Paper text:
The serum glycoprotein leucine-rich ɑ-2-glycoprotein 1 ([name]), primarily produced by hepatocytes and neutrophils, is a multifunctional protein that modulates various signaling cascades, mainly TGFβ signaling. Recently, we reported that the adhesion GPCR latrophilin-2 ([name]) is a TGF-β-independent receptor of [name], and the [name]/[name] axis exerts both angiogenic and neurotrophic effects under hyperglycemic conditions. [name], an LRR protein family member, comprises LRRNT, eight LRR repeats, and LRRCT.
The refined structure of [name] adopts a horseshoe-like solenoid structure that includes eight central LRR repeats (LRR1-LRR8) flanked by LRRNT and LRRCT domains. Similar to other typical LRR family members, each LRR repeat of [name] possesses a conserved LxxLxLxxNxL motif (where ‘x’ is any amino acid) composed of 24 amino acids. The LRRNT of [name] contains three β-strands, and its N-terminal β-hairpin is stabilized by only a single disulfide bridge that connects C43 and C56, whereas the LRRNT of other LRR families usually contains two disulfide bridges (top). The electron density map of the [name] crystal structure and OMIT maps for glycans calculated by PHENIX42 clearly showed that N-acetylglucosamines are attached to four asparagine residues: N79 on LRRNT, N186 on the convex surface of LRR repeats, N269 on the concave surface of LRR repeats, and N325 on LRRCT. The glycans attached to N79, N269, and N325 were located on the same concave surface; among them, both N269 and N325 are highly conserved. However, O-linked glycosylation on T37 was not observed, because we could not build the three flexible residues (V36-L38) of [name]. The structure prediction of the [name]-cytochrome c complex using AlphaFold-multimer and the molecular docking of cytochrome c to [name] using Cluspro40 indicate that the conserved negatively charged residues in the concave surface of [name] (E76, E96, S100, D122, D194, E220, D266, S268, and D295) interact with the positively charged residues of cytochrome c (K9, K14, and K73).
Numbering used by the authors: 39 to 347
Write the structure that this text describes.
């Protein structure tokens, strides 16, 4: 039949995929463990779609044009581990949506149309490990957002319109691993934002409007594997900024990228020159890391000017 979904009876249980011309099932098999319902065109799903699905662990509801969710949608699946709502038209979440969702690990709200983030929309999440809010229209983040997510590993906020970051943004997770802030409108990075996460591994800050990094901003970073600062508006950086990054302290799994910045290569960059000389086999985009001035060295690479001392 062409109206039936695709079941894959397996050792855990079924995995079911529905896309047109298939029909959204009115009930789920009791042993459904993974459910994907995508490429439909509906303002909302049936509020009781998940009824009885007490083995469901992963719910992929990508690209359906959804504009709202029922407040009771997840009540039949307190054991849910992964909820993925990529590429829908959500502008908010109903209150209490997550009241019984204490074991949810991954929440993906990538590419909806959230313009604000209400702290109360996440009430009830506590085991959260992966929070993906990228590709929305957020300008501002409320205080206390992450304070309960002790187990948070990844925070993805890239490709929003964020103009500032609240100072307490990283204060709840015990050991954040990856922080995606690329493609926003951030302009400064303060002394304290990264203080709660000394063992952060991945920091993506590229494609912002970054003009100033406070001198102590990286003071406590002990094991950074990837630092992307590329594509910003940095003309200089203070002395000491890099003292704990890279060699000789840490062998970065990937490295760093400071390309696409209007570097001003005078003696205020000598500390960066020194640091760059010790890290060159970890330097991405070296050919695009060039001085914007002064006129004598305009257009030359940082490394060439660094090598020249
Ligand atoms: C979805 O449904 C509405 C009304 O039926 C329609 O205007 C819209 O073009 C449809 N298709 C897509 C891709 O959104
Ligand atoms: C964190 O936990 C308390 C409940 O003890 C709650 O009042 C507060 O709203 C929670 N914060 C978030 C973002 O859920
Ligand atoms: C950085 O990267 C690409 C080009 O490298 C481009 O989007 C733009 O010049 C910079 N990023 C932005 C504005 O988000
Ligand atoms: C970057 O390197 C490519 C080839 O490696 C070269 O075309 C270019 O001249 C370099 N610098 C530029 C475009 O400023």
């Amino acid at each position: 039949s062409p109206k039936d979904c695709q079941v894959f009876r397996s050792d855990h249980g079924s995995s079911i995929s529905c896309q047109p011309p298939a029909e959204i099932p009115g009930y789920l098999p009791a042993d459904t463990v993974h459910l994907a319902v995508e490429f439909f065109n509906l303002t909302h799903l049936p509020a009781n779609l998940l009824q009885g699905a007490s083995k469901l662990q992963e719910l992929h509801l990508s690209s359906n044009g959804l504009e709202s969710l029922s407040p009771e949608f997840l009540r039949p699946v307190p054991q849910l581990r992964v909820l993925d709502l990529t590429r829908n038209a959500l502008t908010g979440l109903p209150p209490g949506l997550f009241q019984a969702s204490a074991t949810l690990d991954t929440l993906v709200l990538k590419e909806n149309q959230l313009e604000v983030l209400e702290v109360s929309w996440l009430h009830g999440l506590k085991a959260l490990g992966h929070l993906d809010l990228s590709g929305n229209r957020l300008r501002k983040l409320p205080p206390g957002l992450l304070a309960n997510f002790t187990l948070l590993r990844t925070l993805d906020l890239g490709e929003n319109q964020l103009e500032t970051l609240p100072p307490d943004l990283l204060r709840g997770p015990l050991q954040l691993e990856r922080l995606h802030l690329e493609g926003n409108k951030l302009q400064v990075l303060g002394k304290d934002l990264l203080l709660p996460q000394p063992d952060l591994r991945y920091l993506f800050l590229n494609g912002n409007k970054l003009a100033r990094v406070a001198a102590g901003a990286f003071q406590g970073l002990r094991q950074l594997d990837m630092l992307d600062l590329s594509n910003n508006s940095l003309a200089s950086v203070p002395e000491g900024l890099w003292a704990s990054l890279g060699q000789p302290n840490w062998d970065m799994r990937d490295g760093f990228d400071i390309s696409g910045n209007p570097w001003i290569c005078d003696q205020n960059l000598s500390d960066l020159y020194r640091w760059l000389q010790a890290q060159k086999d970890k330097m991405f985009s070296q050919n695009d890391t060039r001085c914007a001035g002064p006129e004598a060295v305009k257009g030359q690479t940082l490394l060439a000017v660094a090598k020249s001392q």
